[PDB]
Swiss-Prot record:
Gene: rntA
EC id: 4.6.1.24
Record's protein name: Guanyl-specific ribonuclease T1
GO cellular component term, pick one: hyphal tip
Subunit structure as annotated in this protein's UniProt entry: Monomer.
Amino acid sequence: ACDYTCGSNCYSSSDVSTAQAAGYKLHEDGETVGSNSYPHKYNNYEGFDFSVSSPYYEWPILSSGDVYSGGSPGADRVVFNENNQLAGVITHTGASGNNFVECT
Ligand SMILES: Nc1nc2c(ncn2[C@@H]2O[C@H](CO)[C@@H](OP(=O)(O)O)[C@H]2O)c(=O)[nH]1
Ligand SMILES: [Ca+2]
């Protein structure tokens, strides 16, 4: 069973922890990857009820199982905070335009 289901993509907790660790490391070092500069601030315009405090940062999680290193980020993202706490896993899949919905 999937711990997080983003559309058709299936992710386990280990998939999320691995992606999160990479994104947080880049955040700490003040570095970014890709043309859209990840990781970067996630403003939460959607208004999700996150259990952890802001600021939030978004980082791509890939269905391939690889850690994001540039190029197309796909539709899925892990959102973490300043303390490297997982806020949640969100996706563009099933959401209009560039909006997000939570992965179930
Ligand atoms: N939908 C949405 N996009 C946000 C939010 N905060 C920042 N963004 C950025 O706005 C764009 C929406 O897809 C993305 O930028 P990016 O294109 O540079 O990755 C996304 O990272 C937010 O709260 N909601
Ligand atoms: Ca996996």
